[PDB]
């Protein structure tokens, strides 16, 4: 089986679960870990689905944010329970929500467009790659749609949460092709993983 | 003046240029550096042109990769010499280029598409966010289009440089409206900065 593991924050958590399912690696690097019957590609979280989409990985792990931003159609067996963070709408304290068309800066433009549609809002979406809290300070946007964990970044920049869009957790996702061709092998790894997750 | 400064690789070269032009900051945060007559927005490299195009910044700096990957109408007043890195086409050493459709992984899909057209190649372009050197060994792509400085990461992953697409440098870019509204202040700051930058890059 080939797995796409999100490098960064959750690497070690997921790697320990794999180990608890009983996996052994023969060689490891910053981007690849192989052993008997298991290969882990250590990729950026947003690339997890692209490694599955393209059929190079059978199973992957990645957050709710990745999946909602990039419409996948991946098999979603279950997820890891820990509430790691939240996708929120935020804006300058007391400014409330601007009348008319809202200028919103975000690293998640699809998520924001669907959010704006759901509220019935006219929005002008300004995609950024990082440090999204600077947009309101600089006059680039009125609001932001971004991830918050402790709320420090928002609080420290005089931004307040105006709406909670969704909680972010690490989902287990399966390539639909591998689910059909390697059915029994996938279900077997997945059962062991779900046991470790429950127990943990 | 409001400057949009690229975090990461080019951050110290640019901040050192401003330091030598006479800029002194009284207050500094991760995202905002304030000084007499100057505010610096510290942003991701690909966001520099966004801050300028929207008109919230007057002058910005970004590498050739940003500039060629995302076309803008911004003005480049002058040339900043230093070669930082290179954009290359790379693949498994010894393999070459497949004769049919080429699967290329990259963080720069427009640059890669432009490269393919310049070759008359039919390409299947796979966008990635980083660790692009893993694509060929995972079977995700035949080739990659990525940045290298010394070739180390490529070399240690058994990827060879098949072609040099362009040399990457720092560029200065100006919001065209700011050139209207703050004409003499901009022109004057750009004069001091080119003097400093020239001396630094050459000597």
Task: Give residue for tokens 């598409």.
Answer: B113
CA distance A34 to A28: 7
Residues of chain B with CATH 3.40.190.10: 1-84+167-203, 85-166
**CB atoms inside a 10 Å sphere around CB B6:** 22
- Among chain A residues, CA nearest to B156: A29
Extended beta strands in B69-111, E state = 79-92, 102-106
CATH architecture of structural domain B1-84+167-203: 3-Layer(aba) Sandwich (3.40)
CATH class of B85-166: alpha beta
> What tokens does B179 get?
């050139």
Q: Do A44 and B131 touch (CB under 8 A)?
A: yes
- The residue among B147, B142, B100, B149 whose CA lies nearest residue B125 is B142
CATH H superfamily, domain A1-84+167-200: Periplasmic binding protein-like II (3.40.190.10)
Helix and strand element counts for chain B (H, E): 8, 10
- The nearest alpha carbon in chain B to A132 belongs to B43
Smallest Cα distance from A7 to chain B, Å: 10
Residues of chain A neighbouring B2 (CB-CB closer than 8 A): 138
Gap between the Cα atoms of B76 and B60, Å rounded: 10
Closest partner CB to A126 (pick from B44, B54, B137): B54
Q: Quick check: B137 contacting A, CB < 8 Å?
A: yes
Q: Facing residues of A124 across strands?
A: A103
Q: Does B161 lie at the interface with A, CB-CB under 8 angstroms? A: no
Q: Is B150 on the interface with A (CB under 8 A)?
A: no
Report how many helices (DSSP H) and strands (DSSP E) chain A contains, helices first.
8, 12
**B42, B8 contact by CB (below 8 A):** no
Residue B105 · residue B135 · CB < 8 Å: yes
**Residue A37 to residue B78: CA distance in whole angstroms:** 56
Structure tokens at B23: 């800029």
Using a CB–CB cutoff of 8 Å, tell me whether A51 touches chain B.
Answer: yes
Report d(CA B138, CA A40) in Å as an integer.
Answer: 10
Rounded distance between C-alpha atoms, residue B176 and residue A111, angstroms:
32
List of residues 6+ apart from A122 with CB closer than 8 A: A100, A101, A102, A116
Residues 25-44 of B with CB under 8 A from A: 30-32, 41-44
Q: Do A130 and B54 touch (CB under 8 A)?
A: no
List the end-to-end C-alpha distance of chain A, in Å, as a whole number. Answer: 23
Q: Where does CATH 3.40.190.10 sit in chain A?
A: 1-84+167-200, 85-166
Cβ proximity of A189 and A36 under 8 Å:
no
Measure B165 CA to nearest chain A CA, in Å: 24
Please tell me which of the candidates A7, A43, A139 has its beta carbon nearest to residue B56: A139
Q: Which of A50, A131, A134 sits opposite B126 (nearest CB)?
A: A50
Q: What is the resolution of this structure in A?
A: 2.0
């Amino acid at each position: 089986l080939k797995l796409a593991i999100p490098k960064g924050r959750l690497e070690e958590k997921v790697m320990t679960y794999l180990k608890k399912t009983g996996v052994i690696f023969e060689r490891e690097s910053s981007i690849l870990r192989e052993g008997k019957d298991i290969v882990c590609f250590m990729v950026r979280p947003f690339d997890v689905p692209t490694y599955l989409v393209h059929g190079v990985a059978d199973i992957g792990f990645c957050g709710t944010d990745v999946l909602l931003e990039k419409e996948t159609s991946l098999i979603q067996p279950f997820f890891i329970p820990t509430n790691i963070s939240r996708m929120v709408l935020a804006g300058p304290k007391g400014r409330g929500i601007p009348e008319g068309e809202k200028r919103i800066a975000t690293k998640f433009p699809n998520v924001t467009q669907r959010y704006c549609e759901s509220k019935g809002w006219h929005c002008r979406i300004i995609p950024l790659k990082g440090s999204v809290e600077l947009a309101p300070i600089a006059g680039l946007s009125d609001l932001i749609v971004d991830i918050t964990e402790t709320g420090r970044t928002l609080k420290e920049n005089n931004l307040e949460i105006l709406d909670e869009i969704f909680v972010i957790r690490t989902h287990v996702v399966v390539n639909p092709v591998s689910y059909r061709t390697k059915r029994e092998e996938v279900v077997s790894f997945l059962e062991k993983l779900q046991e470790v997750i429950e127990h943990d």
